[PDB]
Amino acid sequence: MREIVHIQAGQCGNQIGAKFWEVISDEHGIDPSGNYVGDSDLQLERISVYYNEASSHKYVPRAILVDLEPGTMDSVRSGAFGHLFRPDNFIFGQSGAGNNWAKGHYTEGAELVDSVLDVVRKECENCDCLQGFQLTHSLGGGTGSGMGTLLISKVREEYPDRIMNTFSVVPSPKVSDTVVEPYNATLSIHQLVENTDETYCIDNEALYDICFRTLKLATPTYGDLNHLVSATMSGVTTSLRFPGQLNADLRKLAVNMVPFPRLHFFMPGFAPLTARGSQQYRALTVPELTQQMFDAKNMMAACDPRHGRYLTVATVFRGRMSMKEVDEQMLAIQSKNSSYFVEWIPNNVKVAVCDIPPRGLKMSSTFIGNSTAIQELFKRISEQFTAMFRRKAFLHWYTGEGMDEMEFTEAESNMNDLVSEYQQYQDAT
């Protein structure tokens, strides 16, 4: 019950999804062929939430892989853990978004969004009681941004009651992997703050920093970053895919973390993060995890929390632990950082506890902080957008697909309004 549908847009979304399904299959003991070879019945007691039991006793992920260029699709298809996706799912076009948002939302996307929605509808009717949607996409790449926003708008039209999750890879502050990414970011954020329940902001910069310093890895390949994001997502969903002394669901997180309709952008975090050698020289206790999760050097979003306040915080543990210990740790961490939390939300730590470790470890933890610091991010992007709009640079590519300036004017105004709201609530009293 409470089945979840997985959508993967853009190249980053698809790669993250490949690693994500690898992780999930490892969790439930699923062979690459798609048949169960596990050992613990609890794996199958909720196997339906992400998988569908196809006949002859096989399992197929409830995935809907979307793209506009067959390259990465074929890469996924050929590689291992690709032979179990249901082959009818791989929707792809030929033109390619060309790293443009106008193509990804108006011209090219309008031709595949119908087929995507049809497969979505088939999967929805297949499920018993739909729980919600999780969309894995970028914010820079044209396909990800444009087509994901279009799909979100259409789905919200057809399912205004379900819950919506997005794992959007926000552009990094220092580097810029693309050139027009401010435009894509602004338009995508406009659509998201329109029609999304929660948005898990991530930067590649923070993941680089974590893989470098904390994990002591000088050679971070994209496999590792995607592995980290996959572990975060698995930690988010294990609260319902598994039994727990204090269980959680996606709707619980949405209610707890989203005080106002618009302010629903979360920065995630994971713990423990230990190098290969520096593991046996540290104790794995709940206080250690809790103290690890609260610092700028372990936030997957490149913005110091100290510059603002945590509006709300959710914390999902795993593995066997003692509830009193967790309560004591949360009390201490809420006490000593009193200036780091908003005054008018007393007891602002949502807690959930699962019963299964994420494999290999004794106990893990996932942090989901809805703070005001992220305003800086938007601030940054907004400014960049403004600059690249003041000269109307690159404007012709977007204008040529039917979009006009007033779109950009409205989107920038909307983002500035959002930043104003964040600022207002940060200094509320």
């Binding site: 190249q11 260029e69 067959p70 390259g71 990465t72 074929d74 890469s75 050929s78 030929q94 390619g96 060309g98 790293n99 443009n100 990094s172 220092k174 580097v175 810029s176 992997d177 693309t178 050139v179 027009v180 990414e181 401010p182 590649n204 910069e205 680089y208 893989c211 470098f212 050679t219 971070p220 390949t221 994209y222 960049q384 600059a387 690249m388 003041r390 000269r391 640079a393 690159f394 012709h396 590519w397």
Partner: protein
């Protein structure tokens, strides 16, 4: 299923294509006769396949003088190309634009377009065009202008990439280079999505200094430009951790409709003996790419600003190092982008290393990087050409050939006005914004 055809105009284009297709046939393990004894499909994007194990290129070699095409037909790469494509004229434009655009080329443009249409309709996911053409030669300039206008009329919205041979400031083999250059630029300015400036003088310099060969033939320059092209297309033709298609190129490197003249650069370029004595850091090769002595156009980047850059890496590359190196590059002051473009990079990574052609000059490397950079320094270069034109027009020199071959003086005046307008636009963009 992402096809892209190649069109080689003029002798320069044909020889560069000889080099490029030699390189490709070496890359995918393709014998000269189209047989083949991380790869995927890969070659499908450039090689079409017939029933047997024989693959043929999607190339259209067009020329007005049969000499070089005959050399191709007689070369070791005889069995490869589809014999219908090797279109040969009868009398070359003889370094005259009017002949190459009004009189002679007007009589085989239709056959060329017909072969283009056949090759296009045999494909399904056509990406765009690769025109390999010089700038000084009559056939190059005239025929390329005509062909670009025709294709833009036919294929409304598709990628159109050129590899021009920008006329050098001091070494000029022709005598009427300013005329052909100005005319072909005035024509192609409204149709070419993205050109690719390369010059022979800079490649001479690079071959002498870096590769330590003092006496290079055109074979060597052709091999270098072929390597650049292969690095451009490796994204389509191979599996990479961050791929990029030509539409991404035209979107990223072209801020305005007219300013679309990025210059090329490649690294590392080191001789076999100097292959050791350096570990070839990706940060090192990035610095090499940004070194003003390594660019393949005789223009000092320090006199202008990089409006955009696109670095395509291949081989054993790790993204964190690329991020660090680009951050360092952004830190330095001598590399000063425009204020209004705070994000001046597109990055692409491929898994396939560059392959060294046997009998070549370079050394087997594990990492390589091709930079396509759109800057403002190139503007000054136009001035030089403009200057030359003015002098050669102040006396009406050589005008009689063009006049008597289907053109008017008012056209020359209009092209001069257009070049002045382009220079004005470059200068206007180069300035900073207020408030």
């Amino acid at each position: 299923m992402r096809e892209c055809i190649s069109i080689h105009v003029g002798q320069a284009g044909v020889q560069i294509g000889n080099a490029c297709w030699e390189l490709y046939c070496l890359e995918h393990g393709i014998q000269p006769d189209g047989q083949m004894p991380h790869h995927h499909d890969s070659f499908n994007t450039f090689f079409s396949e017939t029933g047997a194990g024989k693959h043929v290129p999607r190339a259209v070699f067009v020329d007005l003088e049969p000499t070089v095409i005959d050399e191709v037909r007689t070369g070791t790469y005889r069995q490869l190309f589809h014999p219908e494509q090797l279109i040969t004229g009868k009398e070359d434009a003889a370094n005259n634009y009017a002949r190459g655009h009004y009189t002679i080329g007007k009589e085989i443009i239709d056959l060329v377009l017909d072969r283009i249409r056949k090759l296009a309709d045999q494909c399904t996911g056509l990406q765009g065009f690769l025109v390999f053409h010089s700038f000084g030669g009559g056939t190059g300039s005239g025929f390329t202008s005509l062909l670009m206008e025709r294709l833009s009329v036919d294929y409304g919205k598709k990628s159109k990439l050129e590899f021009s041979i920008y006329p050098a400031p001091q070494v000029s083999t022709a005598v009427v280079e300013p005329y052909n250059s100005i005319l072909t630029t005035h024509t192609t300015l409204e149709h070419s999505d993205c050109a690719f400036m390369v010059d022979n003088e800079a490649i001479y310099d690079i071959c002498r200094r870096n590769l330590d060969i003092e006496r290079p033939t055109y074979t060597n320059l052709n091999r270098l430009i072929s390597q650049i092209v292969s690095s451009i297309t490796a994204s389509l033709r191979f599996d990479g951790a961050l791929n990029v298609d030509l539409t991404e190129f035209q979107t990223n490197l072209v801020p305005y409709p007219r300013i679309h003249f990025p210059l090329a650069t490649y690294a590392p370029v080191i001789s076999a003996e100097k292959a050791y004595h350096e570990q070839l850091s990706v940060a090192e090769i990035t610095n090499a790419c940004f070194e003003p002595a390594n660019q393949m156009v005789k223009c000092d980047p320090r006199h202008g600003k990089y409006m955009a850059c696109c670095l395509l890496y291949r081989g054993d590359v790790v993204p964190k190092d690329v991020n660090a190196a680009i951050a360092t590059i952004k830190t330095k002051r001598s590399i000063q982008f425009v204020d209004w473009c705070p994000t001046g990079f597109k990055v692409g990574i491929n898994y396939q290393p560059p392959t060294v052609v046997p009998g070549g000059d370079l050394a087997k490397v594990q990492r390589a990087v091709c930079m396509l950079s759109n800057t403002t320094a190139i503007a000054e270069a136009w001035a030089r050409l403009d200057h030359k034109f003015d002098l050669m027009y102040a006396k009406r020199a050589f005008v009689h050939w063009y006049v008597g071959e289907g053109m008017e003086e008012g056209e020359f005046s209009e092209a001069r006005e257009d070049m002045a307008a382009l220079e004005k636009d470059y200068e206007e963009v180069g300035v900073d914004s207020v408030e």
